[PDB]
Design a protein around this motif. Sequence first.
Motif: not given
Length: 313
Positions: A69, A100, A104-105, A108-110, A113-114, A117
Amino acid sequence: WSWESYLEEQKAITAPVSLFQDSQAVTHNKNGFKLGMKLEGIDPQHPSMYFILTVAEVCGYRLRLHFDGYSECHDFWVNANSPDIHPAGWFEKTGHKLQPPKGYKEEEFSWSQYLRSTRAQAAPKHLFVSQSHSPPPLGFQVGMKLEAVDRMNPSLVCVASVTDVVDSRFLVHFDNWDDTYDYWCDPSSPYIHPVGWCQKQGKPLTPPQDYPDPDNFCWEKYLEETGASAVPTWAFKVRPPHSFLVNMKLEAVDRRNPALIRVASVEDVEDHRIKIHFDGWSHGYDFWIDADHPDIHPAGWCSKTGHPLQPPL
């Protein structure tokens, strides 16, 4: 080009392998890191902080890591046996905070899930020397206090705390400052001392930034007001001086271009540091480095690990 015949021309010797730490010398481990693999690691510029990182490049036993990012201008190089990197999931299991990927808030990061994605693979756990599964250094607990040299300003010995503990190492932090001055070390670090060392030595102790009425600063009062204990004196160990001698040759990472490793020479020594000279280059590029720094290696390391070595000039 070979070391064998360079030493003939120059009438020189290389620093023996025995002079080095095992981690600086080892050539026989494979680099299992693959392009695109994701993992976690400290920011070398903010060593208390943990980020999601991706393998951008591999070269021999070294790898270039990218902050997910963020800009590619922040990429940095480590060895495959670096203790400053950890498998996906490590921060959660070990009580470390994640910074993160950009956007990313807070919570929120997992990883699951990342990975979904991005369709990426986490670097396998078996790659990492450091996963917080080994016994800590005895007597160094999170929140304990000590005196530490500011390595960036080394005239100063300063009020410090243990803020992090990972395997054999712990994080030294300067009370009331940001983490830019933080450094990781072990109980034999020459830069750390028990509470009271300065007073014993007749040396000025630097108190916490903006401490009220600084230098009526008193350890007794500070320990009491912060509910904190001193690292026990028995916990500190004396590291022997290194045995590198002037004109001994070796291989070293170029700090102005860390992809490259250059033919190098011992220019000067101190008990725990060496002055590196890059053969063929101006001595204006000479620099001081700790004898235990991960980026100096015996002659042959590059050849044996698969990394290109830069010859003199």
